[PDB]
Amino acid sequence: DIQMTQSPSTLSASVGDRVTITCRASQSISSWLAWYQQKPGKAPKLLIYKASSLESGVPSRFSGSGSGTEFTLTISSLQPDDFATYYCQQYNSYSHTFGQGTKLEIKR
Template sequence: MRVLLVLLVLLVLLVQGSWAGISLSQSPRSRVLVPGQNVTFSCQASSNVFSWMNWYLRRPGQPTQLLISKASVRRTGVPDRVSGEGSGTDFRLTIRGTRPEDSGFYVCQQSHSDESHGGTAPDKNLLQGPGPRGTQTCRNPDLQEEPGP
């Protein structure tokens, strides 16, 4: 009986430790691409969130749009060229054949832990398009823009 109690306590501690304070980080921090290319954003969780990862698109003056839920479920109205994958701690959002209308902030959010529910990665990726010479810039808005040539 005592062994069972010890195992139960260890299980509770393990579950509490894995759910408490889950933090997320996104990458890449900076990337330039040509329209029509593919871009992949990565999101890493500090603890296992299984498949409970969502991807959102934020645009100034527009409501936040849920693109992908449960790591890979494309929401209604989201084009087929947008896809999500991953499980555990590593997740990816891929946009194939980028277009100017894809511009905005891409944010991952875990929905595994109630404690962190609603919390998003502090690093938001920006897909900005079209810029000089027909390029699009995908960058973290917290970084300063580097002067171009």
């Protein structure tokens, strides 16, 4: 089982900034990766699959990139609606594990 870790565990940002989240796999998973956004108490929403491709309807300000055992996602212009929890998922080899989950909050 490939164990997926995320960084940082909790990130503090502000509206208008550009934010980045890193996701690392214990073993190689090729380019098979997906990112999900979940609001508090709601169902998750797919954002990026294949680690580069954007799901139709997702705002263009999201963008991800990665090759193997090292992946990243970034939001170029952070919006008030973008504060949620972000999860990794690798679908190479069975038992498609998720990630710990990076939480996005507001600076005060």
